[PDB]
């Protein structure tokens, strides 16, 4: 239930091995399971060589806070998982980006958090790990092998990312105005003006529910409703081979567009299946990814389908009279 989506925890032995680009959706999901995306991020941004998630995979990733509702659902994507799928971009942190207090950053190699206008990740170089405060990377002899466990990866917030239905700019302005009405005291969130203020305090940790609706910044909400609907779309199913691994792009395409590959009850319901009469040695099987579905948020008197939805810790500034 909380285990891997399609692929068990990776067992790497060659930290210099290249990370291939896989076109198939199931192949990308398998890479996400093994934390290949986080390793690629660290290689691209942090002068790091090797892998994270050794023997544990994405299912063993550390979370802040430790109790995570959406981590139980292995099918709910995180900001890094959505980044690997082209859904968003986890930008490398700059000096202006704020590190939220509360997580245990000691020994972490990568950690990302959603900021008011995006998603920001911090990484460390080869043979280095974060200090207790997370401000600096220092030499760590336990990371010298380059094949690191999943607890070196920290994801901040209870976040689920999904395909969105774009909303007009006027709707976003209405949502933003309602959010400003709900948070009169807030002035700056992550260094971004929320309300116009004349005199503000220092940044403070700020645990808040938010939805990213594909606009300039996020819609932070205090009173809202959420409902999860299973739409049985193609992205909700992953095709594997039961021992070989994820199916190739062509195999997955044939399975999802021909109704001949076998699958679970939901896949047979939505796309059809042909059990028996084994044409191949062992056909691909497509199964529903374990998630509560797509989230629809009723906020400010309107229902939207956000790009991402979560409850996370940001840094906010309060008005000073």
């Amino acid at each position, epitope marked *: 239930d909380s285990g891997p989506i399609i692929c068990a925890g990776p067992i790497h032995s060659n930290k210099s091995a*290249d990370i291939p680009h896989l076109l198939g959706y199931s192949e990308k999901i398998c890479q996400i399971d093994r934390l290949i995306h986080v390793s690629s991020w660290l*290689r691209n941004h942090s*002068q790091f*060589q090797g892998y994270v998630g050794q023997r544990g995979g994405r299912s063993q990733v550390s979370y802040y806070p430790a109790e995570n509702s959406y981590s139980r659902w292995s099918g709910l994507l995180s900001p890094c998982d959505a980044d690997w799928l082209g859904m968003l971009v986890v930008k490398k942190a700059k000096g202006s980006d704020m590190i939220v207090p509360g997580p245990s950053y000691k020994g972490k190699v990568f950690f990302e958090r959603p900021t008011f206008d995006g998603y920001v990740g911090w990484g460390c*170089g080869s043979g280095k790990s974060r200090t207790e405060s997370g401000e600096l990377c220092s030499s760590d002899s336990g990371t010298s092998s380059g094949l690191l466990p999943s607890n070196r990866v920290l994801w901040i917030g209870d976040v689920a990312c999904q395909p969105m239905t774009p909303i007009p700019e006027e709707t976003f302005l209405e949502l933003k105005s309602f959010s400003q009405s709900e948070f009169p005291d807030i002035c700056k969130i992550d260094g971004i003006v929320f309300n116009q203020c004349e005199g503000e305090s220092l940044p403070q940790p700020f645990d808040v529910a938010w939805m990213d609706v594909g606009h300039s910044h996020k819609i932070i909400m205090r009173e809202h409703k959420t409902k999860w609907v299973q739409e049985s779309s193609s992205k909700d199913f992953v095709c594997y081979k039961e021992g070989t691994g994820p199916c190739s792009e062509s195999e997955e395409k044939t399975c999802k567009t021909s109704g001949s590959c076998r699958g679970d009850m939901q896949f047979c319901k939505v796309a059809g299946c042909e059990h028996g009469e084994e044409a191949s040695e062992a056909k691909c099987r497509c199964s529903l990814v374990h998630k509560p579905g797509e989230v629809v948020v009723s906020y400010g008197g309107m229902r939207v389908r956000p790009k991402c939805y979560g409850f996370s810790r940001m840094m906010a500034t309060l008005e000073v009279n």
Partner: antibody, heavy 119, light 108 residues
């Protein structure tokens, strides 16, 4: 097959600009750590600048603010725009590739282009 | 930030001799040390990466050892074509600091 070729070097007046360029064959440049190194005549190698495959750029202390490393995906080109040049910048410049598999060692080097800053 | 010092600034040895060049870092760089060879008027050539791994195509007489702050490049049997300047570089930090080269002259 795989190679880096420098261009754009030559004589520059002090306080001028010349914008060295480096064309790659077999290397995507945008997918690699690309560095500029320089060697003054009769001196040792000196790292000038680096750009990660993620876009992060770092510069030597003596070239901060004056030098700008950049990439351009078309033509597969890595450029170094140098401004406010002085006599201390007269050197042979190499574009190199830091390969992560080699722990970011400069496995690939260009032939080098000599820039002379004299009036 | 990181200072990279090669103790034998200039070296001279006969053909077939054993040559050792020591590099010392101001701080621990783990094993992220590389040795490059530069013939006069040519681009540097990577000899060793990871402070011990030999680059493909490099003759086996070149070896690298050490870790932390002390490293050594060894030529088991000096050849007439081994005359060049040898550089130690750290790839632990984004500064990619090069050490001052060691010139290996050849006696005869």
């Amino acid at each position: 097959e795989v190679q880096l070729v420098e261009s754009g070097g030559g004589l520059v007046q002090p306080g001028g600009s010349l914008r060295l360029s480096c064309a790659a064959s077999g290397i995507i440049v945008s997918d690699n750590y690309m560095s500029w190194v320089r060697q003054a005549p009769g001196k040792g190698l000196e790292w000038v600048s680096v750009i990660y495959t993620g876009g992060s750029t770092f510069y030597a202390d003596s070239v901060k603010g004056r030098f700008t490393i950049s990439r351009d995906r078309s033509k597969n080109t890595l450029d170094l725009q140098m401004n406010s040049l002085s006599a201390e910048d007269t050197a042979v410049y190499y574009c190199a590739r830091a390969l992560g598999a080699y722990d970011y060692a400069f496995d690939l080097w260009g032939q080098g282009n000599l820039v002379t800053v004299s009036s | 930030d990181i200072q990279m010092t090669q103790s034998p600034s200039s070296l001279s040895a006969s053909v077939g001799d054993r040559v050792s060049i020591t590099c010392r870092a101001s701080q621990t760089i783990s094993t992220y040390l590389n040795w490059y060879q530069q013939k006069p008027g040519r681009a540097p050539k990577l000899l060793i990466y990871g402070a011990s791994s030999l680059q493909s195509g490099v003759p086996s007489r070149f070896s690298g050892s050490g870790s932390g702050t002390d490293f050594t490049l060894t030529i088991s049997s000096l050849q007439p074509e081994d005359f060049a300047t040898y550089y130690c570089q750290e790839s632990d930090s984004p500064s990619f600091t090069f050490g001052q080269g060691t010139k290996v002259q050849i006696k005869r």
